[PDB]
Design a binder for this molecule. Structure first.
Ligand SMILES: Fc1ccc(C[C@@H]2CCCNC2)cc1
Ligand SMILES: Fc1ccc(C[C@H]2CCCNC2)cc1
Ligand SMILES: [Zn+2]
Length: 140
């Protein structure tokens, strides 16, 4: 689990979005595993605006932060988890690292702020849904 809180926005994995998230839907993309809902309380997170390929992610299944090198956001085929089947995901970044289902929502961060959230895993890789393209998260 886990979310990003920036202004009046909550960013979550689309597959973990709550009834409240969907009731206050701002934007969702099934291909990206992202949903943004509106919040009454102002969030304090900063979204990274950059093309860093290094950062640190929180891995709840190890209660540890790991430094990783990660690929630029791409269209990637993802093999069978349990929440999703096998299928294709856009704006996805991979690193070598530990990821289990419940690690989704772990934040990946660089010096510039939040890069993305854990979204996929398995075969010794971790996949992160990029948010750095969502410039609109930084206003109203
Ligand atoms: F009125 C409402 C409000 C939110 C949901 C959305 C949830 C999301 C998970 C799947 N069950 C539905 C439905 C109806
Ligand atoms: F998890 C992290 C990782 C790094 C920073 C800090 C910056 C500044 C020092 C070098 N670049 C990184 C913040 C949160
Ligand atoms: Zn950066």
């Amino acid at each position: 689990s886990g979310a990003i809180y920036v202004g009046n926005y909550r960013v979550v994995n689309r597959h973990l979005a709550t009834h409240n998230d969907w009731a206050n839907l701002v934007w969702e993309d099934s291909s990206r595993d992202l949903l943004v809902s509106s919040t009454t309380a102002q969030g304090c997170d900063t979204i990274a605006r950059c093309d860093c390929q290094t950062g640190v992610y929180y891995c709840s299944s190890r209660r540890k932060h790991y430094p990783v090198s990660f690929s630029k956001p791409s269209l990637i085929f993802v093999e069978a988890s349990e929440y999703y089947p096998a299928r294709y995901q856009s704006h996805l970044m991979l690193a070598v690292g530990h990821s289990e289902p419940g690690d989704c929502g772990g934040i990946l961060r660089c010096q510039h702020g939040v890069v993305g959230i854990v979204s996929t895993g398995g075969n010794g890789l971790v996949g992160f849904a990029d948010v750095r393209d969502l410039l609109w998260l930084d206003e109203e």
